[PDB]
Design a protein around this ligand. Structure first.
Ligand SMILES: Nc1ncnc2c1ncn2[C@@H]1O[C@H](COP(=O)(O)OP(=O)(O)OP(=O)(O)O)[C@@H](O)[C@H]1O
Length: 381
């Protein structure tokens, strides 16, 4: 009565859903062709609710009615210090309702709705559910959904409630780094091993020490930085290309937000390209005042702009080892998670930190959490 159960990585910035089919984990692509889906929701002036790429690609000078980063708010109270800090940086409205941080948006034609953070995330989970059902060709009722290891009781329960709203019975909550370890089959291994998970995504950086013993995972310690990810690498490059365009012409592109938003879209695309190549083409038509945008970024310029940010990721790692009474030599397994660990520099920096030890290779870092949840989901029928 559980049918085909789905594994869902419910991401701050991007979500992934996988499933076990014909003896194999399959990561499923969305109706836009992508194996990851933005954790974004938007409400058009007409009233169309967009979820995913369409929400994130859709452009206006209306940041107020596009919702994202609900994972920063999920399971938290309005008066939580983290919530107070985060809403300062969020362009949509957040109000106290039922003791919680509700999102307030215009739903179309000046009509206001408030959504609990778990209601926003249910919209995202509804998207993943549709993605899986389209691929499977049948309905889905049950999910394994992952959460960060530091997630507490109310955050875990709120993630289950998002599922309930989305029409999924979240059968199991699994910690994200455990699911990555599982994707690499690290619970098969005999003996006791020490597992370091370095998980650098779009908005957050998480480091976790796991211990495995005959299939049994224990989170020994967690560290990181909640406001460090791929997005912050994007910002550095936008500032370089905004201060290159001023000291070229004389103008200021920040005087118009729609241009800024297009530059973002393209800087992001180039950054990814630069994980494969040594230069990228940034090209946007009638960028600002009809005048056009064609510029190029090198791999090495990207690293130079972000080097201090790349190096900062090592201090939380040292901290995890400290807090767990371990030294670099006691790590049997290094696991890289998150789309930002596709960056050549990051990978170089981890391997030198571990004095040349190779990390697990083989699953798209992007996908490893959804994949491992799909391994557990597979067994569950
Ligand atoms: N090939 C690539 N090279 C460089 N960066 C990439 C690549 N692919 C994806 N990224 C970046 O990774 C980030 C998204 O990471 P991920 O998909 O792990 O998000 P997430 O699960 O929501 O994580 P978080 O919750 O930490 O934001 C984005 O900033 C994106 O630009």
């Amino acid at each position: 009565d559980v049918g085909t159960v789905v594994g869902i990585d419910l991401g701050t910035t991007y979500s992934c859903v996988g499933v076990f089919k014909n003896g194999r984990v399959e990561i499923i692509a969305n109706d836009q062709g992508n194996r990851i889906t933005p954790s974004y929701v938007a409400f058009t002036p007409e009233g169309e609710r967009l979820i995913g790429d369409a929400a994130k690609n859709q452009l206006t000078s209306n940041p107020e009615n596009t919702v994202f980063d609900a994972k920063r708010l999920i399971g938290r109270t309005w008066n939580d210090p983290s919530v107070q800090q985060d809403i300062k940086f969020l362009p949509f409205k957040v109000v106290e309702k039922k003791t919680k941080p509700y999102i307030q948006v215009d739903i179309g034609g000046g009509q206001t709705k408030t959504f609990a953070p778990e209601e926003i995330s249910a919209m995202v989970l509804t998207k993943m559910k549709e993605t899986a059902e389209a691929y499977l060709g049948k309905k889905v009722t049950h999910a394994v959904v992952t959460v960060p290891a530091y997630f507490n009781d109310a955050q875990r329960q709120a993630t289950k409630d998002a599922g309930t709203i989305a029409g999924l019975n979240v059968m199991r909550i699994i910690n994200e780094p455990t699911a990555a370890a599982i994707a690499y089959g690290l619970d098969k291994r005999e003996g006791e091993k020490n597992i370091l998970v370095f998980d650098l995504g779009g908005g957050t950086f998480d480091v976790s020490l796991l211990t495995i013993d005959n299939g049994v995972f224990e989170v020994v310690a967690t560290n990181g930085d909640t406001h460090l990810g791929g997005e912050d690498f994007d910002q550095r490059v936008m500032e370089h290309f905004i201060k290159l365009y001023k000291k070229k012409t004389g103008k200021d592109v920040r005087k118009d937000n729609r241009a800024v938003q297009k530059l973002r879209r393209e800087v992001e695309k180039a950054k990814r390209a630069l994980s494969s190549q040594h230069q990228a083409r940034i090209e946007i038509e009638s960028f600002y005042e009809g005048e056009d945008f064609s510029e190029t970024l090198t791999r090495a310029k990207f690293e130079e702009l972000n080097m201090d940010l790349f190096r900062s990721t090592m201090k939380p790692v040292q901290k995890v080892l400290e807090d767990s009474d371990l030294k670099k030599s006691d790590i049997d397994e290094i696991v890289l998670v998150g789309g930002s660990t596709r960056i050549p520099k990051i990978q170089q920096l981890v391997k030198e930190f571990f004095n040349g030890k190779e990390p697990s290779r083989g699953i798209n870092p992007d996908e490893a959490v959804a994949y491992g949840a799909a391994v557990q989901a597979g067994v569950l029928s």
